[PDB]
């Protein structure tokens, strides 16, 4: 056989094996569960891999909560020395909450993760200082942002919603300008044209959270009329809007059609009510990052902060963790009234 | 079954064909042509010679500099890390200038390299067009190839040169990268409201699909009549044989009308050319005379009335 | 080593050498321009960049 | 702010679109006229009624050919004469087919055995008026490539397994340097040409397989006027004879198979 | 009416089914058994489309929208006003397309030609079958088919593409587009070269294989030849349809996430994995 | 086993072996370099970012 | 070195050298225009 | 071992060796530039790195 033919066949054989390795090592398979949400033939629906969904349901199992004690008797504000936010809670429920917070945040480290074991009133550890601010954040969310966290059902949030039994939640973000590039006259690192984990590992902008979930840059780019004259948004801006919308799909485990009809992205007449809830989710996240997480910058140790020294911040996946509702909508705050009212 | 003429295993080695004598003043052809059995299986076995006139060498020099600008900046964008260059190669690009600078010359780090690469690449493409034109004339051929090439250049110039000028910003132009220029294509549709509703995008797709339809039909027609020497098309044009008659009768009996061995290549020429001609026009319209194509489609009665299965929702930004 | 030029064509070597040396020199000059310390035009102080995520100038 | 508006309802993009429609309508008219440079005007079941259809036939154009083989004007004012095909109509009404006559339907000139009356001279090369197709015994500058089959000396076999002859030489295209015909010495000492596109070279068994003709039908294939060159008309005759076998070699091949 | 050379070619035979009963011409068109079947399916399918349009809210040609059943109906035959008409039109379309391909086989046999043309068309049929039966079958519901409407089926394409949030990153989509774009480039080159050779400047002789092969050797250093370019035209167009069928069949039955995420296998190769 | 060279052409074997050995060694060197433990230049990969964010509009 | 024109076509050398010098000169002018300090039209910022 | 230049064309070996060694040297020089420690032009500490515990 001709050598050129042998090389061509060998190259084709290698490619076929390489393709087989990629195909069988990455692809999913039927059966697939479909949840239709739009009109027939409009291709507005959600896909769910049953094997992936079974794994997801396993890790979103709500832990059982201790029964609530009666609220008659001594109050933790009078009984204890340094109690600033849980003043109105009775002693029995105060102890129940501390046990609940331990399992929700640091089940491995126990009560010693936040407390000096011999002086409970001491605030020497930064974790207790953050925990007190976190309690205020939870109370703020459940009371003032029920337009989002109680949009359809009285779900609310607790410490377990974000922490999931870990001191550091799985999904956080920092100010990220992008990986280090060459200096001088080389094209600057613009936070784009690199694999972006928040944007589904595409080359879309890698930090859509800073302009939108911390600052309040306008997300909308589309014109509201047929002809030009009213819209000067650039394709450059559309990159960051596209990147943020890609992060929404990862955070909720849905696709674009869950909140949009793709034939007109800006349209609210064609949009599901989930788009309204997501709209308030933006404003809630900005409130959490600007008023709670960012002011805690000095309290966090330097290894808990980003490469730029900013405090870790919340986005959609911090609560949702890949599900359209956190813990599939199961509520854990109903038996913790003290976490639903601002002191 | 019958020989399907998929590939040719029986091959003959003849003397190399250097081509017709060139007109006086032309260069000598470059390279010593050689026979390759691998390429003889599917097509012609001879590789070379090549003609490198002024246009060819000038185009290569201009184009090579543009390629160096892209590659150096891509490699600098991973901080000269070769493992990261291989890992991220599809994701890398030379980004167009920032919107601040408009049509002016941007700094090197903020789009200056993009503009120079755009200029040198455009010069290389234009110089290649001269090469396609002049090589056809030197052989006594028509310039149909050059003018078809000009159609492809029109879409290229509309995307990167004409439309950014009409919009007043080089920032609207595509980047020089593989995945990023796919991002630009999608971001273009997102910004200007579903380019599916651009009628010249519809036409360009119709001709893009039509080009695939025609070449499959025409290639299949010639292959089905190679037993009659159907692939000797120019000889069929000037002296029609049974291959031409059967090809014409196959399509006449199939769909009621037919082309000729010459006119089918006119159908194919225009269908390919109209892909980028209508495409270029459609790109020049968006953002200049139309800002949202779906709303333009609604205005002109082409938006299908899909039912809304959700309760009515009000823009929450209005009530805030 | 004069005997090596009977084996290698001087035309091929000189043309390949000239292209290789220019590209190498162009690459090295670019690498220096891609550093703050060895940038000989604007100097060690890199200029501030404009906002990419910005609207069209209107 | 309404940029691009001509009236309250007509805008610039709409006008450009209708401009394209006018051009595209003209282009289709132009293309359809170019389609009518061969075979028009149409013939009917009337001795002197011709149809040109819509759009009409275009103005004539002239091709200049190489090596003083003349000028060709299309559409032809007087169409080329047709071969004298031998077939009997299956019915009298228009649209009915006909049945070729004769014991050897491949020689009837009807159906797939028909061919065009092309030039009765060999196709010449562009550089020299030398015939383009030549046997390798004449075109000694062409030799078979190695690592590929060499069909010289192989048996020529019909689809019924009957050996009709042996392959003696190959005819090459002096312009494209490829094989177009295999010359076979038949058992009746006939020396016919077989089309390469209709030949399956089985180098394992040393046979050239014909799926179109039985062994005995190969013996009646057309022969060249002179042994060292083939005219364009002869190329059409040879192709028509072999290719019509797929429909005429056996009665089964012409009838519905299911 | 017949072309000047046509009458000698109108022989009996070449049919697969029926034989002499349907072996006749109507005007320029040959009928055969599958021509009857193709005509039946085409006419009935078109008439059902008009009836489905009559049930709809508009007669605007661009806005007519015939939609498939709900996903909840699964693989069952829905009521006619709720996607059942779409299913009937789909069956008619499948019958019409297959009959058209089979009719071409008989026509090619009548002319003694190869079967390359129906072979090439079969890949177009495969892509359609992938869209309306194969992909819906793997998803378990006929509701996954695209609606029948000139502008409404673009809405299905758009929404389907964004169910994976960036459809450009689909790897089979990239290959299929590369074939479509190359086919158009190849078609433009081939059409130009033949016309340039057949139509030189006025008064100049027509040019043949020497100039045709010589042209691309001069400009690019290689010529594929007349046989190769027509092989390439089929191969590019056929593979564009084949990889189009692949790109959509893997979107949903074999991939339920964003397409850019699929490229994490390359990003995580141990030679450079983070 | 010297007879192995009566069966295979030495020119192809050495070229194939040389290409094979370099690609494998390049593969192994790169796999170790991408690890934190066996990176012999800097050690663990810190993933440095650009010094400052690109300013907002 | 007068013998370098015996093995090199002077027509080919001049064409390649002419295009190269013009491209290089365009490259350098373009680089300077994109610098802050050496922009001679709008000047430094 | 000198009986290798009769077996391998010296022109092909030297050209292949020249291209291979230059590409290899480019690869190594490029990798060192990408490192923080072995970059000989701008030197160490070019970007921002998060502090570790
Ligand atoms: C986009 C739009 C695309 C639209 C495509 C339309 C195709 C129509 C097919 C026409 C068939 C035909 O007969 O050709 C006539 C015509 C040529 O006519 P002619 O040869 O000059 O006239 C002959 C004489 O009149 C003498 O002619 P004749 O009297 O012999 O003709 C008789 C002819 C009837 O023809 C006509 O009378 C003309 C009809 C015009 C409509 O045949 C019949 O009688 C049919 C009888 C009914 C039975 C048919 C079904 C039987 C089974 C067949 C198998 C299954 C099908 O061909 C065309 O008009 C083709 C032009 C279309 C070009 C489209 C190019 C594509 C553009 C795509 C654009 C995309 C981007 C935008
Ligand atoms: C989400 C994305 C949007 C979309 C956004 C766009 C945008 C933006 C554009 C298109 C365009 C097109 N779209 Mg679209 N398009 C969408 C969906 C589709 C679908 C589908 C089934 O969904 C299809 C089939 C298409 C198909 C098409 C084509 C008809 C058309 C491209 C023509 C072409 O061949 O350009 C390819 C050919 C060129 C670009 C010219 C190249 C010629 C030059 C000379 C090349 C030189 C190469 C050089 C020498 C080498 C340099 C190498 C260096 C290293 C750099 N689109 C969706 C709705 N589409 C283009 C168009 O024309 O629209 C009107 C276009 O600009
Ligand atoms: C990081 C610390 C140091 C440094 C550390 C090292 C170390 C360690 C080494 C080098 C070596 C080299 N360094 Mg250093 N080097 C540094 C920075 C630089 C800079 C710069 C701009 O900063 C430059 C230009 C260089 C340049 C060089 C080269 C002189 C040399 C690589 C030789 C080579 O590639 O042969 C490739 C080319 C050939 C082998 C020619 C082939 C000849 C053939 C066989 C004959 C036929 C030719 C054929 C016909 C044509 C094809 C060949 C063509 C060249 C393509 N270094 C920094 C400052 N450098 C290496 C060295 O010294 O090697 C001697 C080496 O070991
Ligand atoms: C009708 C529209 C379609 C079309 C048509 C079309 N394209 C065409 C043509 C036509 C008719 C040509 O004639 C032309 C051609 O030449 O084709 C063979 C071409 C062409 N279309 C091409 C590409 C192309 N076409 C595309 C699309 C299309 N082309 C449409 C579908 C696309 C897509 C889909 O994106 C691409 C990518 C090219 C293959 C070719 C134009 C080639 C060209 O412009 O060459 C010059 C450009 C350069 C970058 C120069 C290269 C320089 C070398 C890489 C240097 C190598 C090193 C150097 C030697 C070292 C020394 C240098 C010194 C300075 C040191
Ligand atoms: C430079 C060259 C680049 C081209 C590279 C071509 C690579 C082709 C193979 C791609 C493999 C992708 C893949 O195979 O997919 C991965 C699996 O890889 C695995 O197992 C291991 C996969 C086995 C190795 C594949 C074959 C390698 C050898 C042949 C190479 C040719 C996906 O991982 P998971 O299913 O989530 O879990 C795997 C578990 O072990 C946990 O980690
Ligand atoms: C591939 C490059 C092959 C090549 O560059 O070949 C050169 C000759 O190119 C020549 O004629 C001139 C032709 C060089 C280019 C050949 C064509 C390259 C591929 C173009 C077609 C693909 C792209 C088409 C669409 C863009 C080198 O010739 P030599 O060194 O004298 O001998 C080669 C030995 O095999 C025999 O001596
Ligand atoms: C199929 C191939 C691609 C077709 C592209 C169709 C483009 C659709 C966009 C469009 O519809 O373009 C319209 C005109 O298109 C028209 O006539 C088009 C009329 C048909 C043109 C010829 C098509 C082949 C026959 C422009 O809008 P208006 O003039 O206000 O329309 C008013 C009414 O006709 C519809 O309410
Ligand atoms: C509008 C269409 C106009 C078509 C006019 C026409 O011509 O239809 C003819 C009549 O068909 C006939 O009634 C017989 C066929 C009846 C209709 C065709 C079958 C319809 C199946 C549904 C075609 O039959 P032929 O005798 O083969 O051809 C006649 C031509 O040569 C006349 O110059
Ligand atoms: C395959 C089995 C398809 C069974 C369809 C079916 O359902 O069988 C009956 C109806 O079939 C009906 O008329 C319609 C029957 C549809 C048959 C579907 C399979 C045809 C596949 C054709 C293409 C094959 C290509 C390979 C009974 O219907 P139900 O049980 O009331 O439906 C309830 C749905 O939720 C089922 O998903
Ligand atoms: C030893 O060297 C090597 C290492 C081998 C080099 C390696 C190089 C590599 C790997 C390069 C890779 C490149 C890649 C992958 C590129 C991919 C590019 C792609 C996909 C591009 C797609 C589309 C791009 C388009 C349409 C761009 C168009 C731009 C245009 C038309 C610009 C025109 C403006 C002109 C004419 C100007 O006058 C303006 C100039 C000026 C005013 C100064 O600036 C304003
Ligand atoms: C080729 C064979 C490929 C078979 C793929 C497996 C079938 O795919 C499977 O179809 C069934 C029935 O439509 C779907 O089943 C779903 O819809 C049906 C019909 O409304 C419901 O009755 C059922 O409760 C629900 O789970 C599955 O969600 C889907 O995963
Ligand atoms: Fe052709």
Residue numbers in the entry:
A (entry chain C): 1 to 343
B (entry chain M): 2 to 321
C (entry chain S): 1 to 58
D (entry chain H): 1 to 258
E (entry chain L): 2 to 275
F (entry chain W): 1 to 57
G (entry chain Q): 1 to 45
H (entry chain U): 1 to 53
Paper text:
Here we present a cryo-EM structure of the light-harvesting 1–reaction center (LH1–RC) complex from Rhodopila globiformis at 2.24 Å resolution. By contrast, the Rhodopila globiformis RC contains a full-length tetra-heme Cyt with its N-terminus embedded in the membrane forming an α-helix as the membrane anchor. Eleven copies of a novel γ-like polypeptide were also identified in the bacteriochlorophyll a-containing Rhodopila globiformis LH1 complex; γ-polypeptides have previously been found only in the LH1 of bacteriochlorophyll b-containing species. Collectively, these data show the Rpi. globiformis LH1–RC complex to be structurally unique among purple bacteria and provide experimental evidence of a phylogenetic link between PufX and the RC Cyt subunit.
The Rpi. globiformis LH1–RC contains 36 molecules of BChls a (32 in the LH1 and 4 in the RC) and 17 keto-carotenoids (16 trans-carotenoids in LH1 and 1 cis-carotenoid in RC), the latter pigments are unique to this species. Based on the density map, one MQ and one UQ were identified at the QA and QB sites in the RC, respectively. The N-terminus of the Cyt subunit from Asn2 to Ala8 interacts with the RC-M and RC-H proteins and a nearby LH1 α-polypeptide on the cytoplasmic surface, mainly through charge/polar and hydrogen bond interactions. In summary, the extensive interactions of the Rpi. globiformis Cyt subunit transmembrane N-terminal domain with surrounding proteins and lipids not only make the subunit structurally unique among anaerobic purple bacteria but firmly anchor the Cyt subunit and thus stabilize the entire LH1–RC complex. Superposition of the RC-M proteins from Rpi. globiformis and Rba. sphaeroides revealed that the C-terminus (Leu55–Gly69) of PufX is indeed closely located and parallel to a loop region (Phe27–Arg40) of the Cyt subunit immediately following its N-terminal transmembrane domain. In addition to anchoring the Rpi. globiformis Cyt subunit by its N-terminal transmembrane domain, four LH1 α-polypeptides tightly associate the soluble portion of the Cyt subunit with their C-termini in a manner similar to that seen with the α3-polypeptide (the longest chain) in the Alc. tepidum LH115 and the α2- and α4-polypeptides (also the longest chains) in the Trv. strain 970 LH114. Eleven γ-like polypeptides are located between β-polypeptides in the LH1–RC with an opposite orientation (N-terminus on the periplasmic side) to the α-and β-polypeptides; the five remaining sites were occupied by cardiolipin molecules. The γ-like polypeptides interact over the entire range with neighboring β-polypeptides, mainly through hydrophobic interactions, enhancing stability of the LH1 ring. Moreover, the γ-like polypeptides block 11 of the 16 pores formed between LH1-αβ pairs that presumably function as quinone transport channels; one other channel is blocked by an additional UQ and a carotenoid leaving four channels in an open state.
